[PDB]
Design a protein around this ligand. Sequence first.
Ligand SMILES: *Cc1cc2c(nc3c(=O)[nH]c(=O)nc-3n2C[C@H](O)[C@H](O)[C@H](O)COP(=O)(O)OP(=O)(O)OC[C@H]2O[C@@H](n3cnc4c(N)ncnc43)[C@H](O)[C@@H]2O)c(*)c1C
Ligand SMILES: *[C@@H]1O[C@H](CO)[C@@H](O[C@@H]2O[C@H](CO)[C@@H](O)[C@H](O)[C@H]2NC(C)=O)[C@H](O)[C@H]1NC(C)=O
Ligand SMILES: *[C@@H]1O[C@H](CO)[C@@H](O)[C@H](O)[C@H]1NC(C)=O
Length: 486
Amino acid sequence: DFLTCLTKDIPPRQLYAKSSPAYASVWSSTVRNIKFLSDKTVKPLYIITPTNASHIQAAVVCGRRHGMRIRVRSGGHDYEGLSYRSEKPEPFAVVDMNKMRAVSIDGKAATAWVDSGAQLGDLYYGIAKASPKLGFPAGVCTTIGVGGHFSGGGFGMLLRKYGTAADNVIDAKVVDAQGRLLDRKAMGEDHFWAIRGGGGESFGIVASWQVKLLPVPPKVTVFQVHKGIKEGAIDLVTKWQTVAPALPDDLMIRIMAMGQGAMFEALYLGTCKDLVLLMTARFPELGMNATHCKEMTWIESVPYIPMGPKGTVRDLLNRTSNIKAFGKYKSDYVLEPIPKSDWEKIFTWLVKPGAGVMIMDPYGGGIASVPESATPFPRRSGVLFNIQYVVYWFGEGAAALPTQWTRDIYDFMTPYVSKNPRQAYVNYRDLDLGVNQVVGNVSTYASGKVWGEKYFKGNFERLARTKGKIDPEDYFRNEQSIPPLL
Ligand SMILES: *Cc1cc2c(nc3c(=O)[nH]c(=O)nc-3n2C[C@H](O)[C@H](O)[C@H](O)COP(=O)(O)OP(=O)(O)OC[C@H]2O[C@@H](n3cnc4c(N)ncnc43)[C@H](O)[C@@H]2O)c(*)c1C
Ligand SMILES: *[C@@H]1O[C@H](CO)[C@@H](O[C@@H]2O[C@H](CO)[C@@H](O)[C@H](O)[C@H]2NC(C)=O)[C@H](O)[C@H]1NC(C)=O
Ligand SMILES: *[C@@H]1O[C@H](CO)[C@@H](O)[C@H](O)[C@H]1NC(C)=O
C-alpha cells in the first residue's frame, strides 16, 4: 500500500524493500558507527533514495496516509544511529539523501545552495574549485552529511572566526509534515530558526541549504605540538583554558588528550611570520617556533587535520570514512577553569584500561558573539571550551570496558563542568542523557525536557512550541526528537 503509493511519483529503481538485492548494500553504506551493523538492530522496511524534492514530498504524503514514519539519513554520522535504526521495533522507512549532493555556487554573490545529502568534503572541494580565497565554517570530518550537521549547528577549526555552520545559513528548502516544499519566506521565522541548531528529524526533511561563503587568506598555518607529562602537559592544559578562548579570532588551538600526552593542534588564518610573534607573547610556555609551522592554502588544511600529510584534496570526495570502528561518545561544556590539581586527577583516568581520548575545542571569539537565543545552539558567551569523550573498539565482545569508561569519566567530571543544566552538544548524541516517552501517539513534553535542556538550555521551550505548530501529531520522531507543546 505504502510502496504502491510511492511508485506513482518515485521510480522503482530508487526504492528498496527488505527483499531487494541492493537493500543490504544501501543500508550498510553510510552506517558509520559499526556497533549498529548487527542482526539485533531494528532496520527500516523501506529505503527511499530521492533525486528530486517531489520524491521527498511524495514520501511524506504516502507516509501520513499509510501510517509509515520516516527517519531521514544524509551522511549517517549520527553517534546513536537514529537516522537508520530504531531502539524498539516499529515500522519505519528511511529517506536516504545521498543522491541529492549538488553544491551550486553563485560566483558573483559568494553564496551556495548545498543539498543535505552532500558530505562536507563535497562542499569544501566545490568552494575550492570556484575560489582559492573562500571557505566555510563546518566540521573537521569529511564524510559528515550536511543535513544532520547543519541541523545541529556544526562546528570545526573556523568556529572562533565565523561561528557554527548554522550561523551562516541564509535560506533553506524544507518538506514539512503536510508534504509542502517551503523556503525561508514560506516556513516562517520560527521554523527557520528551529532548523538552525535544533537537531535533525524533528522539523521535517531539509532538502537544501543556502549558505554564505566566507573569506579566508591565500595561506594558512597549521601546527601540531605533542607534549608528554614530564614536558609540562598538565601545566600547559591548565593555562590553555584561559589563553585559547581569549586569543585573536584568527587562531584556533584544539587539544587531543590521549594517555600520557596532550597534542596541541592549530589552524591560524595567516602566515608563520605573524604566528610566531603572537604565540611567544600570548602562550610562550608551549615552546612554539617556526619549525612547527606548516604553511598551505585553506583547502589543503582540510584533509591535513584528520588524515595527516598523506591526505590529498581529492580524498575529500571519498564517501568512506577514515574511521572504521565501534564507538561511544559523550560531551561536556566548561564555563570555569579547572585547577591544576584536578587536571592531574583527570589525567589518571586516561591510563585506565579501556580509556579513550578527550578532544577539547576552545570557544570565545565569533562563536560567542551570537546571543544565546538567536539560534537553538545555546553554547555561546561564557563557554571556555567543549570536551568530547571518544572511545573506539573492535568486536561486540570488547564493548563492556570502553563503554563503562565513558560513563565513569562523565560521573567524575560532574563538579568541573556546566551545571543546571549540564550542557551537551546535540550532534554529539548520547542516549544516556534520556530518551522520549510516548503517551497517546505523541512524545511528551516532560520526557523531552530532560535531555532537551542539556542540548538546548532555555531554547527548548521555543523549539517545542515550534514543533507544536509544524507537526502537532508528532509524525517526525525518534528517541531524541523535539516533543510538541500546544
Ligand atoms: C562520525 C563523525 C561525526 C562528527 C565528526 N566531526 C564533527 C565535527 O568536527 N564537528 C561537529 O560539530 N560535529 C562532528 N560530528 C558529529 C555529528 O554526527 C554530525 O555533526 C552530524 O550529526 C552528522 O550528520 P549526518 O552525517 O547527516 O548524519 P545522519 O546520521 O544522517 O543524521 C543525523 C541526525 O539528523 C537527521 N537528519 C539527517 N539528514 C537530515 C535532513 N536532511 N533534514 C532533517 N534531519 C536530517 C537524522 O534523522 C538524525 O536524527 C566526525 C566524525 C568522523
Ligand atoms: C521535481 O520537484 C519539483 C518540486 O516538487 C517539481 O515542481 C513542482 O511541481 C508541482 C506539481 O507536481 C508544482 O505545483 C510546483 O509549482 C513545482 N515547483 C517548482 C518551483 O518547480 C518538479 O516538477 C519535479 N520534477 C520532476 C521531473 O519530478
Ligand atoms: C624550536 O622548537 C624545537 C622543538 O621541536 C626545538 O628542538 C628547538 O630547539 C627550538 N628552537 C630553538 C630556540 O633552538
